[PDB]
């Protein structure tokens, strides 16, 4: 009988994700605003450390499918949840956009987010390249808001506890007010959860604030949450029980209840949590057309491939006849990833790698690369966790005509704000605010159609109470 | 920074529940035999410590809804899973029946179960009265099979770690080959899971075999499983991922994967587990008409009332108009339970207490008691964990005319085998075996209808592949 050191009795902070990541993961970010605002009061009085309610795919979803202005959604939340720390997910130099943007666009986006009420900015990069997060972090500090540097967790031959402790130091070196360990594919097991959270605390000290964001996709992360807390994690992200599990997250009430008697405790009001649970439990059924159909999947521990990525490929394979070659492409991924430097397999890396893996089982190994893949191999998306296969790099140099870069990609981007400003100002509907110019800069394709319909007001693509009853 | 003692690195045994409890909890025990046998080979080679595949509600379900002979199902499993230890759930002196039976019926039932292949018998009692489990345990030892004494976990003012360690000793005192901690309502939290499993091991020694059966109804039991393993639990019950969570159990693959690096390990073959997962993942959809619609519910931690019990009452309340008195009956339960001696709230105690609670909010407090309730208060179902309110006892004595007893109820039951034998032998279809006589003794009402249709062969009340496609 050995022994395990655990942190002193203490409160554990909880961030509620129901308003953003939960519906983004369980119902394709289609959650309408009218189905959320009725819980904002209770959520505000629940006792959460922070409430994730913006950023991520919600901006896209708002203008693309709900005819809703993300900014207006941010202002209503700021108003309905006055005492809460609002939190968002922002993908560094990419913001919530489709590409890297010149620093001047980042400054404004952060600026307006803060100005409209955002308090905590979780800045992250798919490649885990601290340089892509650098300027975003700065803008956040400039606006006097909380800058949370993010480490996208993943499993690979080059990812080690030491490798994560180093990244933490870089994030702190660039002024991170706290470090977020983000595990979107529920790959973080219990021992690793404990060792990593302990290693960071031991190296930079107990005052270092760390927030653990784990999905429940594989079904082992709630145990990791307990281990992270024993290791001393400061805040853990959860989703209200009526909106949890599956590709979602662990249950807030479940994570709050499991601690009774451990010496660890949460600052949550269970009666409030109970109102928020019922609120979404009544609403969720209307979103049945967008739910996933797998509650637990551990396959990723053997294949390194996340369901969303696996399926996306399977379709590409049928849409091209002989898909049965799935077994072949499922074996090419590991090799393609390695070539790219073992980037964490999250959007967009996951589709970039997945797709390329197909063009390797199809035409031939790198006989032809997509423009996106070539861009990763050449460094236009940043630095990889491990050096990329010089061979495949050269091949990309020859197939693209672009030369490899190794410095922060945005270092080559020219000012564009003025160019954006003018362009958006010619679209019917444009209201003149920077907010709208950002909308156009982030979604050039949708900004037009949205600016023209916005006056109609937001909508819902969910079933109506009528459609619901008429179905069953 | 304090420290927590954990058991030495070691293998943890796993019992698969997919074949019995999983479908009993997720799809009203309607799982057809033709939808299970195709996984028996893989399940047999998976590496499970035991495979729960009989007993519980499956006997009833077989003869009542599937026109299937439980005994034939037991013989096919014994044949398709030759190298596995088969396990079942048997409710002591009640067997799988509707009442206590004279010892001679228990002897035969166990006898035939063993003779038809059952290896591990999990004997338990709703009231946790060791005397009701006593003879069943004996019969199991007589037949040279594994006798697992069961402790139904629950939370109440009189249930303590000490109180459970005592029960364990009684179970061992009556020859238990191992102790099963059964938590049907997912009430077992992590610290309690650790303390109880440690207290038992510390008191009777490390060789004492303990199996932990936890449901996932509240969403905190997988963390309890980790704590039980650190405390030294020997075997934990899980359900294959495509048939888990909700009122079900934790995911077998999830519980197997979360241990990597802890020093704890399982003896499971992940590829086999992968075939069993897909097998049930393809079949499960056909049982959609019987699924529950709540994945996580922690309400029971505040109300002591399990969803199934809560709903059952709510219907009784509407079926009697003013149900809105739910808030009243939900407050009477605690008081009614206390009166009965705080019995664990599982079948049948839960309905007996729930119903009576209504007749207390309706007619008046105990103005009228059901015959079942009177029976609990008088002791015809056995001893309660804590002494019953002498007042309410007297009231039952007066309303029933029955006198209170305190000795094992079966001590007053006369031989009945011969009486059963004759009676069943007059039913059209009866095949003459003791097996059939038992069927009649356990389900007098159904034995007739089943004995007459059995020749038609088993059926399925699930959707057909055709009905499935035609629906969506
Ligand atoms: Co997430
Ligand atoms: Co059970």
UniProtKB/Swiss-Prot annotation, chains A, B:
Co(2+) binds at residues 21, 182, 213, 215. Its EC number is 2.1.3.1. Keywords: Cobalt, Metal-binding, Transferase. GO terms for molecular function: metal ion binding; methylmalonyl-CoA carboxytransferase activity; pyruvate carboxylase activity. InterPro entries: Aldolase_TIM (IPR013785), Carboxylase_cons_dom (IPR003379), PCB-like (IPR055268), PYR_CT (IPR000891). Substrate binds at residues 20-24, 57, 182. Residues 12-274 form the Pyruvate carboxyltransferase domain. It catalyses: (S)-methylmalonyl-CoA + pyruvate = propanoyl-CoA + oxaloacetate. GO terms for biological process: gluconeogenesis. Binds 1 Co(2+) ion per subunit. PROSITE patterns: PYR_CT. The keyword Endoplasmic reticulum does not apply. Its cofactor is Co(2+). CDD domains: DRE_TIM_PC_TC_5S. Homodimer. Transcarboxylase is composed of three subunits: 1.3S, 5S, and 12S. The core of the enzyme is composed of six 12S subunits. On each side of the core there are three pairs of 5S subunits. Each 5S dimer is attached to the core by two 1.3S subunits. Thus the total number of chains is 30 (6 + 12 + 12). The 5S subunit specifically catalyzes the transfer of the carboxyl group from biotin of the 1.3S subunit to pyruvate to form oxaloacetate and 1.3S biotin. This is Methylmalonyl-CoA carboxyltransferase 5S subunit. It comes from Propionibacterium freudenreichii subsp. shermanii.
């Amino acid at each position: 009988p050995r022994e395990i050191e655990v942190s002193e009795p203490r409160e554990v902070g909880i961030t509620e994700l129901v308003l953003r990541d939960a519906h983004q993961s369980l119902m394709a970010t289609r959650m309408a605003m009218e189905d959320m605002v009725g819980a904002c009061a209770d959520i505000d009085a629940a006792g959460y450390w922070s409430v994730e309610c913006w950023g991520g795919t919600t901006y896209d979803s708002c203008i693309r499918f709900l005819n809703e202005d993300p900014w207006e959604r941010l202002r209503t939340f700021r108003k309905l949840m006055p005492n809460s720390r609002l939190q968002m997910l922002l993908r560094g130099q990419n913001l919530l956009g489709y590409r890297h943007y010149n620093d001047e666009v980042v400054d404004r986006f952060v600026d307006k987010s803060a100005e409209n009420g955002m308090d905590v900015f979780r800045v992250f990069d798919a490649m885990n390249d601290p340089r892509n997060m650098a300027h975003a972090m700065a803008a956040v500090k400039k606006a006097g808001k909380h800058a949370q540097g993010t480490i996208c967790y993943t499993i690979s031959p080059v990812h080690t506890v030491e490798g994560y402790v180093k990244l933490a130091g870089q994030l702190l070196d660039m002024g991170a007010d706290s470090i977020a360990l983000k595990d979107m594919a529920a790959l973080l097991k219990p021992q690793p959860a404990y060792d990593i959270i302990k290693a960071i605390k031991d190296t930079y000290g107990q005052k270092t604030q760390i927030n653990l964001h784990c999905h429940s996709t594989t079904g082992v992360t709630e145990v990791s949450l307990m281990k992270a807390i024993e290791a001393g994690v400061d805040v853990v992200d959860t989703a209200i029980s009526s909106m949890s599990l599956g590709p979602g997250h662990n249950p807030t009430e479940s994570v709050a209840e499991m601690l009774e008697g451990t010496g660890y405790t949460t600052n949550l009001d269970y009666d409030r949590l109970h109102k928020i649970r019922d609120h979404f439990k009544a609403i969720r059924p209307k979103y049945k057309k967008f739910e996933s159909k797998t509650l637990v999947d551990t396959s990723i521990f053997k294949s390194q491939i996340p369901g969303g990525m696996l399926s996306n490929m399977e379709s590409q394979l049928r849409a091209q006849g002989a898909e049965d070659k799935m077994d072949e492409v499922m074996a090419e991924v590991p090799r393609v990833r390695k070539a790219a430097g073992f980037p964490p397999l999250v959007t967009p890396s996951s589709q970039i790698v997945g797709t390329q893996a197909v063009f390797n089982v199809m035409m031939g190994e790198y006989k032809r690369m997509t423009g996106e893949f070539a861009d990763i191999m050449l460094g236009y998306y940043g630095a990889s966790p491990a050096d990329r296969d010089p061979k495949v790099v050269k091949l990309a140099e020859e197939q693209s005509g672009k030369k490899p870069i190794t410095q922060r990609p945005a270092d080559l981007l020219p000012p564009e704000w003025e160019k954006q400003s003018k362009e958006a100002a010619t679209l019917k509907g444009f209201n003149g605010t920077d907010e709208d110019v950002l909308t156009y800069a982030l979604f050039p394709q949708v900004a037009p159609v949205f600016f023209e319909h916005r006056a109609e007001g937001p909508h819902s693509v969910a079933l109506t109470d009528a459609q619901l009853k008429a179905e069953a």
